[PDB]
Amino acid sequence: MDWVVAPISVPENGEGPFPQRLNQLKSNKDRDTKIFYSITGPGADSPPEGVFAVEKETGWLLLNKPLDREEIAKYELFGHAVSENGASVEDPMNISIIVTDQNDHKPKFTQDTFRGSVLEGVLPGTSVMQVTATDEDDAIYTYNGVVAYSIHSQEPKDPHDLMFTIHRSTGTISVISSGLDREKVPEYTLTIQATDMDGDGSTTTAVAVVEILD
């Protein structure tokens, strides 16, 4: 052809229909004799078996089911070409398959509860703590794995509500009001959120507990 194929990029979670054609393998010895094609490697003849196949007669490389980037992100397979008289007519061909991302993981907070303390007299603008959520999707080329933080809600609501903020990118929680008074309200429970696609995607929650120190 030459007996080569460029790396193939396949987005995960393809709709099909399956089996899906990716590339047609072909040995120029098929002018001379009938060629039988086959494939080996993890994803073909070793676990996960049968994700990919090749059609014996035609050389079509097929994907049999949708892929999942977070299970396996890249496959390295080998294609074979054998004459009808049983002789290999090519050295095995390196077939590289790269699985590209879709946004299919929700963020996950690293803790169900995060705790931080401040002195009663801290001024507005004071950083209390930094929370974190991870996201298994790509955050280099897209926002699939990019988390935006927000505050869902605060209890109690004394001396008033929305006394805290969270930095949309860093997860740093700050107090933005005056009026902390430990003798009145010694602790606040914040329900916090993390949302992928930098705020447009899906959202998980955790708790941040703010202790007013004595």
Residues at the site binding a second copy, with contacts judged by CB under 8 A = 1-2, 4-6, 28, 31, 139-143, 146, 168-169, 198
Per rule CB under 5 A, is residue 101 in the interface with Ca ion?
yes
Question: Which residues fall within 8 angstroms of residue 41, CB to CB, at 6 or more apart?
Answer: 75, 76, 77, 78, 95
- Measured from the CB atom, the residue of 76 and 120 that comes closer to Ca ion is 120
> What's the one-letter identity of residue 52?
F
From Ca ion, a second copy, none, which one binds at residue 84 (CB under 5 to 8 Å depending on kind)? none
Q: Which two tokens stand for residue 211?
A: 């202790």
Residue 178 contacts residue 212 (beta carbons within 8 Å): no
Question: Which residues fall within 8 angstroms of residue 31, CB to CB, at 6 or more apart?
Answer: none
- Measured from the CB atom, the residue of 28 and 110 that comes closer to a second copy is 28
Least separation, in Å, of the C-beta of 119 and a second copy?
31
Neighbours of 209 (CB within 10 A): 15
- Measured from the CB atom, the residue of 185 and 197 that comes closer to a second copy is 197
From a second copy, Ca ion, none, which one binds at residue 208 (CB under 5 to 8 Å depending on kind)? none
Which of 57-85 are b and which e, b meaning 16 or more Cβ less than 10 Å from the residue's Cβ?
Answer: eebbbbbeeebebeeeeebebebbbbbee
> In a 3-state reduction of DSSP, which class is residue 28?
helix
| The one among 45, 55, 104, 211 contacting Ca ion by CB under 5 A | 104
- Measured from the CB atom, the residue of 1 and 119 that comes closer to a second copy is 1
Question: Which residues fall within 8 angstroms of residue 178, CB to CB, at 6 or more apart?
Answer: 123, 124
- Measured from the CB atom, the residue of 141 and 183 that comes closer to a second copy is 141
Per rule CB under 5 A, is residue 137 in the interface with Ca ion?
yes
The 113-132 site mask, x for binding Ca ion (CB under 5 A), equals -------xx-----------
Least separation, in Å, of the C-beta of 48 and a second copy?
26
Identify any residues that bridge with 23 across adjacent strands, giving them in sequence order.
61
Per rule CB under 5 A, is residue 90 in the interface with Ca ion?
no
**Given the DSSP bridges, would you call strands 148-155 and 187-195 parallel, antiparallel or unpaired?**
antiparallel
From a second copy, Ca ion, none, which one binds at residue 121 (CB under 5 to 8 Å depending on kind)? Ca ion
| The one among 35, 37, 188, 196 contacting Ca ion by CB under 5 A | 196
Interacting residues with Ca ion (CB under 5 A): 12, 68, 70, 101, 103-105, 120-121, 135, 137, 144, 196, 214
